[model samples]
Target: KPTIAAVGGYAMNNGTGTTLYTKAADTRRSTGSTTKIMTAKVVLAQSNLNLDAKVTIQKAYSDYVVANNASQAHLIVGDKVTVRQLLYGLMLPSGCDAAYALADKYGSGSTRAARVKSFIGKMNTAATNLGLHNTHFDSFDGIGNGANYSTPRDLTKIASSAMKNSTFRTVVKTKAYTAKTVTKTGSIRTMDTWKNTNGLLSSYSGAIGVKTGAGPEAKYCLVFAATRGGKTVIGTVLASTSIPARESDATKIMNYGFAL
Candidate 1:
């Protein structure tokens, strides 16, 4: 039997919408940053999506990250980045700032707070549509207001649904990315290269994406997927001990998933 760490769990996708193995994966727990997976999914699903649409950076986004001590993409205020680049910032750096920007950009409402509410509403709607009754989100990013949570099974399933988007699949696997944004004066500024936080992409031979999360309550979590010899396995681990433990737990599940 393959051993796992934390609230250890895994599931295998048999080239179809099917499950093979599980390990207490249904227990709901705080998701931390994994919530972004659904955020990206909702944004990508928008009809008439414009990946090139430019969104201006705002102090509110940066302030939100600072207030919560959350990770960010280092997007400078007054600069303008495309929706495509914001996606990279959201996943790669696990940027709460980027999350805010996306939510504000796509969410329709009269105010920032109202748009955030609607964006989160869309997240819950998507979860319900997917029949993930165990999942709920209170914030655009995983830095929940104590009301955000999901099970490993629910989170894993979300990633599977999201992976169907070619753009998402490409973004999650990319180890590093750079965005050229429009300055306040309309000049292009080359920002720092954002790095993917998922360690498995570089450590595991076939590892491809998903996302990672952490918080005082969430500890650590990872939704991961990998492919080998035409086989792909996807699953999640919640409330893991540390970064290494989270990655290793994910590794155990992935290895077991492939074996099954």
Candidate 2:
């Protein structure tokens, strides 16, 4: 058994979904930005999806991050950003602003609140379709409004399913991305590059993606995946004390899993 910092986690072979390591794996807990995986998944699943479609950055999106002190892609208000870039922002920087933007664009309703609520329902529907018993989401970005939660096993499965989409895989694995946004003034503003927060990409061999997340209650969490010699493994770690701690825990489990 590998000793690790996360209170709960699970790892498995990507091909068989055979769990290789587990620690309180099925226990439900708050999930931070890892929730965005489902957000992106739901968007990709939408019929007639247009990745090139541009959505104007809204004041409310900026306000949500400002009010919550959440992570952002530094998207300016009124700037026009494409759906593909928003997915990059969502995964790479864990941007709550991009999360909100996607939800609002794809979510059906008359108002922003109603639209986001609609989007969340889609996330729940996706979870239900996956047969996840211990997962639920109330916020698109994992800010959690009391009922948002998922188990490590559940999250690992979610990521595995998300990885099947080439676009999702591409966005999450990217180390950095620079998006050009159309400013309200009609100028093309090249936004600062957004970097992936998951450190395993640099520290561990074969590290591909997944995501990194944190919050007051969730502590530090990571959904991780890697491929070595054509064999892939995926996993999740939650409630570690810090970023490095979560990455180390993920590395430990992934190493154990790959060895198996």
Candidate 3:
């Protein structure tokens, strides 16, 4: 595979047969919003999970998005959304507000700051457990405070682990989703539709669940997966030049992976 200075990626057989290609696959770089993949992973790993559990949309979540000017699901403050709906909001729109809500709900602490830190600690711990030594997450979302990064190989492993959860797989593969939530006033509120950013879902044959990312420092990145003839290939690309180029790279790598 061919890529640029900050680009990195890998493609492999679904279970563990062989590596198809690697392009600076272990070189660490800012991950951008693809960090939400891990966010969803961590939330889904909780015990006695309740996909239908309702979480009130806090003003703090929306405030955080405003403070950072980050991507949002347009989650209205005071809406009571379900765990499943948040997963959709997190992945499809790369919603930092949704990420904040999950981190707040699942993390343990008396204060929101402490809870967020604890959640990030869990993310790092998850990476360590998965043997992803090249990865670290300082933010629940990919808007890092100078210390969130991962390699293409590490991210691919993370996505693979996430894909094991059927719910996670469904959320990422969905091209668009709309959620109806209960309002603080006890009325139903239909949220703005969230659309997946991963272009491969539409353009590539057998393309499935994954995430896309971009930032001033991270450039454009994508973690991609596809299935064909009972064989599934998963990969990642970080710091690509543009969205179209990232999709192109994923297409070529996935093709090369299946051919292998």
Candidate 4:
């Protein structure tokens, strides 16, 4: 019979039926920055913000970098950018600032923080609309705010949803992207470059776009994808101790998935 086999460990957070070992599967934990995958999904699904939509830099949105201590796209106040470029900034460099910029601009408010608050509601609504029962969103960048959370099972589902969106999949799998500064003061500026953080693209064979997340509370987490024999598999792990640990676990799970 055809079946799903988890090599080291795995779980199904949401499904139709019950299983004996499902409870024994590791419990849910904060997935850290990996939550951005859902953020990307929500935007791709709801917003019509074209890749070239104009965006202006503001302190309210850009300050998230210092506040969260997360990666940055080096956007400064008063700089101009576009929606298309922000996608690369968000995924390639894991720029919290870029996420904030998107939330603030496309989100619900006139200000950046208000937009973040607005965008989060959209995130929850997107989750509900998708029937993702095992997930929740507390922040755009998956910061440790005690409310942002999801299980590996839910993350796998979320990743699958994201991959289905050609733009989301394209953004995540991209190794590098260049975005020119929005023409400011009637003068053209240099284009900025961003590279993806997911090392799987370089190290693992058949690897493709996905994402990685980590923190003190979330530990090391990763959502990865690969193809084999004309089939694609996606996997997620939460709260690992080391980089190698997360990579090792994901590789094993993906291998098993391919075999299935």
What are the runs in model 2 whose C-alpha is more than 4 Å off?
none
Model 4, 1-260: lDDT tens per residue?
Answer: 12222221342211222221222133557878888887788777764757777788887666668877887877767878888777778888888888887887778777666878889999888878778776788899898777777776677777777888888878888888877685558566776667888888877788886898878788888888876677676767677667777777677666665564
Task: Give the alpha-carbon lDDT of every model.
Answer: 0.89, 0.93, 0.89, 0.73
lDDT of candidate 3 over 154-239, digit per residue (tens): 99999999999999988889999999999978999887778898888899989996999999989989999999999999988899
Highest TM-score against the true fold, candidate: 2
Model 3, C-alpha of 154: deviation from truth (Å):
0.3
Instruction: List TM-scores for all candidates, in order.
Output: 0.97, 0.99, 0.97, 0.87
Better of 2 and 3 by lDDT: 2
TM-score of 3: 0.97
Determine the backbone clash count of candidate 4: 2
| Full ranking by TM-score | 2, 1, 3, 4
Model 1 per-residue lDDT tens digits across residues 6-93:
7746576836756755677788889999999999999999986899998999999988899999999999999998999999999999
Give model 2's TM-score versus the native structure. 0.99
- The per-residue C-alpha lDDT of model 1 at residue 106 equals 82
| Model 2, span 154-193: residue lDDT tens | 9999999999999999988899899999998899999998
Check candidate 4 and list the clashing pairs.
Answer: 51-84, 173-209
